[PDB]
Amino acid sequence: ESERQLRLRLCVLNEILGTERDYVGTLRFLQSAFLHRIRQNVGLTEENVKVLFSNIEDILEVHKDFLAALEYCLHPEPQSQHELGNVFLKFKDKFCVYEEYCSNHEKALRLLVELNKIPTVRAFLLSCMLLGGRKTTDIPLEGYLLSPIQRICKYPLLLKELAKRTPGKHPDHPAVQSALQAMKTVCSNINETKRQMEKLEALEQLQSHIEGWEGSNLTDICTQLLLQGTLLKISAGNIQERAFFLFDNLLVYCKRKLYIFRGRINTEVMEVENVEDGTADYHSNGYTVTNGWKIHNTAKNKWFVCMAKTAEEKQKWLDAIIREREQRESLKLGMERDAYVMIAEKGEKLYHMMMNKKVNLIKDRRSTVPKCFLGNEFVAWLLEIGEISKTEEGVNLGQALLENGIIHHVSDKHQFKNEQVMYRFRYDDGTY
């Protein structure tokens, strides 16, 4: 099985590199979309930025060199002979940059909650993420502000797995084990990361007590266990008692023996339905249901019935299941509502701003095309007027206007580009 422990090591190496790359990119997005753009065109005060982002720029400079040494050891590719323990050890002292950030984290969130109450500041914050390239309906800024705390806690989890796939023969063995101990002591010193590490430890401890795990690791999809309990899975032809675990974003049912993995469901495709005590239907295999409900895997269009011992447990479960749905569905729908309002606002604003003869850009050009403007001119005018800083920001803005039904190509055959492609506001041609 030596080759098994080999490909397994490379997967760890490939992951450490690929995840570190996406981390630095996330840091490089936070400064360009936020810290840099406001430090140029000076409703977000300077103190507001210092509170929200703290030393995120110092964290970047550290991880910009970490990634270099990571790619340095893993050149030309992630090869098994390559050693990575020394890298973590010679950056172990530089990781104290997380001290100030994790301290200011609570204060930053408190500010963000009050800033999001102001509609103009919420829109500006969301406008920064749009211009920076990243989608606004995906991860909220609260999550971006936390990813430093998450990343520094993902290092012990990654090094542990690497140490498992690294034999005592490999010269990196004394270093990987020494680096794992050092990375743990880093997180343990900081209070904010200590709470995070113990929350990730719980997810991984549970996954270790489950045999035959299939799918993505809990530490990569969930954050906390919501409810655990043993129920009856009256699936078609299989009425067996199962141990159910409800996390955020995932539900998994196991076979109690420690547990043995049986199946898992993503809560996004899960739809529950109550069955009154005394009901008997096909999903219950004909048996009378008491203190039970019904689950529907809308991905597979499969229904299966759960039953609890007490009616308290039924309510305890049904209540916890509804909460998870509402919590994530409110966030998602909320980010998607607060993002349409800024585009509609900026769309109507830039329309009237462009209609004035000071910078007339929606001119009837030529067959004649009425009330059209040029993408090249539009992007340039945005930088002149100061609404954007880079040109990549201008196309990201125009595309968001095209996608959100504000503008469109004259022939609806092109997306937004910095070329002299003619676009028109959907107001002028009655398509709004």
Residue numbers in the entry: 42 to 83, 90 to 304, 467 to 575, 579 to 644
How do the authors describe this structure?
In the autoinhibited structure, the final DH domain α6-helix is broken into two halves at residue Ile237, forming a closed helix–turn–helix hinge. Conformational transition to the active state requires a complete, roughly 126°, opening of the helix–turn–helix hinge to form a single extended α-helix. Hinge opening results in rotation of the DH domain away from the PH domain—this transition enables GTPase binding and activation. Extending along the hinge helix, both Met244 and Leu247 are intercalated in the DH domain surface, further supporting the closed conformation. At the DEP1 latch, the largely hydrophobic α4-helix of the DH domain is positioned in a cleft formed by the PH-DEP1 linker helix and the DEP1 domain.
P-Rex1 and its close homolog P-Rex2 are highly conserved GEFs that activate Rho GTPases (Rac1, Cdc42, RhoG) to coordinate cytoskeletal organization and cell motility. P-Rex1 is a 186 kDa multidomain-containing protein with an N-terminal catalytic DH domain, a PI(3,4,5)P3-binding PH domain, tandem Dishevelled, Egl-10 and Pleckstrin domain (DEP) domains, tandem PDZ domains and a phosphoinositide-4-phosphatase domain (IP4P). P-Rex family members are autoinhibited under basal conditions and are thought to be synergistically activated at the plasma membrane by receptor tyrosine kinases (RTKs) and G protein-coupled receptors (GPCRs).
